Curated annotation (Swiss-Prot), chains A, B:
Plus-end tracking protein (+TIP) that binds to the plus-end of microtubules and regulates the dynamics of the microtubule cytoskeleton. Recruits other +TIP proteins to microtubules by binding to a conserved Ser-X-Leu-Pro (SXLP) motif in their polypeptide chains. Promotes cytoplasmic microtubule nucleation and elongation. Involved in mitotic spindle positioning by stabilizing microtubules and promoting dynamic connection between astral microtubules and the cortex during mitotic chromosome segregation. The modification N6-acetyllysine is found at K30. This is Microtubule-associated protein RP/EB family member 1. Acetylation at Lys-30 by KAT2B/PCAF promotes dynamic kinetochore-microtubule interactions in early mitosis. Composed of two functionally independent domains. The N-terminal domain forms a hydrophobic cleft involved in microtubule binding and the C-terminal is involved in the formation of mutually exclusive complexes with APC and DCTN1. Residues 1-65 form the EB1 C-terminal domain.
């Protein structure tokens, strides 16, 4: 029953995919909403948004990702 | 070659999983960092953080998720 076990695997895998897909873009649209607050207040009123833009472009990786936070 | 095709499937599935897993928690820790700015400024200095907390608890779902943003 080689493939039979793999049938279970694609199922548990795809379901993890589906729940992860939803979350990825669920919060992804959220960062934009926080960035939209930034576009409103950056330089205009509140500098706090500047350091939250830093969040949306904070890349904790091995390689240093080039970004421009302004 | 039934299982052979499934071997490919678990691979492409798991890889999507792995890249999605990293992103889920990658940004997940980020929302906390934005929330930490909130804990600093909420009621103290900047009300902007209040409406960004609204983001971290904004649940675009069918069912209405009960939350307390303060
Ligand atoms: C967090 C995103 S920022 C980003 N990337 N595409 N769109 N956006 C927007 C979403 C939030 C604000 C801009 C980022 O730098 N990823 C790092 C990365 C991974 C691969 C290439 O680079
Ligand atoms: C966005 C999170 S808020 C959340 N949930 N667990 N920890 N956190 C923290 C991360 C950001 C600030 C608090 C949320 O309501 N999900 C909706 C949900 C899905 C299932 C149950 O409920």
């Amino acid at each position: 029953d080689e493939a039979a076990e793999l049938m279970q695997q694609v199922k548990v895998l795809k379901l993890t995919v589906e729940d992860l897909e939803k979350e990825r873009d669920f919060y992804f649209g959220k960062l934009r909403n926080i960035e939209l607050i930034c576009q409103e207040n950056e330089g205009e009123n509140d500098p706090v948004l500047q350091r939250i833009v830093d969040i949306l472009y904070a890349t904790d990786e091995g390689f240093v990702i080039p970004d421009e936070g302004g």
